[PDB]
Design a protein around this ligand. Structure first.
Ligand SMILES: O=c1ncn2nc(Sc3ccc(F)cc3F)ccc2c1-c1c(Cl)cccc1Cl
Ligand SMILES: CCCCCCCCO[C@@H]1O[C@H](CO)[C@@H](O)[C@H](O)[C@H]1O
Length: 326
């Protein structure tokens, strides 16, 4: 394919002629994104240029992790790859990676909604999340900026968009043994924000965050306190449930019920994505024959400590072996 090279905000962009009208959209810690017109399909696409993929072992592993993940994601409510490319002709000159996906045009942060909107948006997050969780993946950072949305309200989960507010309390306590329901806590927070037009737990730090959570959900019972190893955490928690019905007064009572089953302190007793999809609140959208699960996903590389050249070679193999969707 014939590549062409141009400069957008001091960043060099070298892409196939397939992609036209490159327009800068923004950036993150892990790269920069342009909007572009895909002449092959006539659709608009988001192109992400990874910034310095192989600067370090951690960058190299992060690059591999992203490419491997997005190659696996094949679902309507989850970001996947239309294309992956590098201007490098060989492994020896391999130093850039570009990822291409279908463009939605907005995130959930740039969007007080009606109840039907909330039903549809949250249903799509949970449908996508069921698929993600079925591959034994935990997102760990669900928040509005990691949810890409259409102008007809279709939603896809992103891995990194353009945080503590939506984090499960056990992550704040640094438990390290997280259940997948950490993502369901995050969904609970987002859902509440959409309904009420305001952040549920706008903590100023990780400590204030727990205070705000405790004010709504109540102090943990005896059964939860005995699971907390940290003497400091236990001393802070004990040195301090609101009627959800009233906190979310005016909302759909089925929306309030679901929210009570998501924002549960005990991660064991939180509703799963698959369980939440069958809640009466989503009766208009729930179709158990169209809520698919994922092919098992090999994350065994995550426990490996490899050199940059090894990560880099493995990333290159995954670029060359990429087969686009139909
Ligand atoms: O609509 C989008 N669709 C996809 N992405 N992807 C990314 S990152 C990315 C990931 C995988 C790709 F193949 C390519 C990538 F760029 C970032 C934003 C984005 C948007 C978007 C836009 Cl264009 C504007 C405002 C807010 C958002 Cl969430
Ligand atoms: C400040 C509010 C108190 C937070 C209590 C969080 C309880 C989280 O729940 C706990 O999650 C752990 C990690 O997945 C599991 O090991 C436990 O079984 C579970 O009870």
């Amino acid at each position: 394919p014939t590549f062409y090279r141009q400069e957008l905000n001091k960043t060099i962009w070298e892409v196939p002629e397939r992609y036209q009208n490159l327009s800068p959209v923004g950036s993150g810690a892990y790269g920069s994104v342009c909007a572009a017109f895909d002449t092959k399909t006539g659709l608009r696409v988001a192109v992400k240029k990874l910034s310095r993929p192989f600067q370090s072992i951690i960058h190299a592993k992060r690059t591999y992790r992203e490419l491997r993940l997005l190659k696996h994601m094949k679902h309507e409510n989850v970001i996947g790859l239309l294309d992956v490319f590098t201007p490098a002709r060989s492994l020896e000159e391999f130093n850039d990676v570009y990822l291409v996906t279908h463009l939605m045009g907005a995130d959930l942060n740039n969007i007080k909604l009606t109840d039907d909107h909330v039903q549809f948006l949250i249903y799509q997050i949970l449908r996508g999340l069921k698929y993600i969780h079925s591959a034994d993946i935990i997102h760990r950072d669900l928040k509005p900026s990691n949810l890409a949305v259409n102008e007809d309200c279709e939603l896809k989960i992103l891995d990194f968009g353009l945080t503590r507010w939506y984090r499960a309390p056990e992550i704040m306590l640094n438990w390290m043994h997280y259940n997948q329901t950490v993502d369901i806590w995050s969904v609970g927070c987002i859902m509440a924000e959409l309904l009420t037009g305001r952040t549920l737990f706008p903590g100023t730090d990780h400590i204030d965050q727990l205070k705000l959570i405790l004010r709504l959900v109540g102090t943990p019972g005896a059964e939860l306190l005995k699971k907390i190893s940290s003497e400091s955490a236990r001393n802070y928690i004990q040195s301090l449930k609101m009627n959800f019905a009233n906190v979310f007064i005016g909302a759909n009572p089925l929306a309030v019920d679901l929210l009570e089953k998501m924002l549960v302190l005990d991660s064991d007793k939180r509703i799963t994505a698959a369980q939440a999809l069958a809640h009466a609140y989503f009766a208009q959208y729930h179709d158990p024959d169209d809520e698919p699960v994922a092919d098992p996903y090999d994350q065994s590389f995550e426990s490996r400590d490899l050199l940059i050249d090894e990560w880099k070679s493995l990333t290159y193999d995954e670029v060359i072996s990429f087969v686009p969707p139909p």
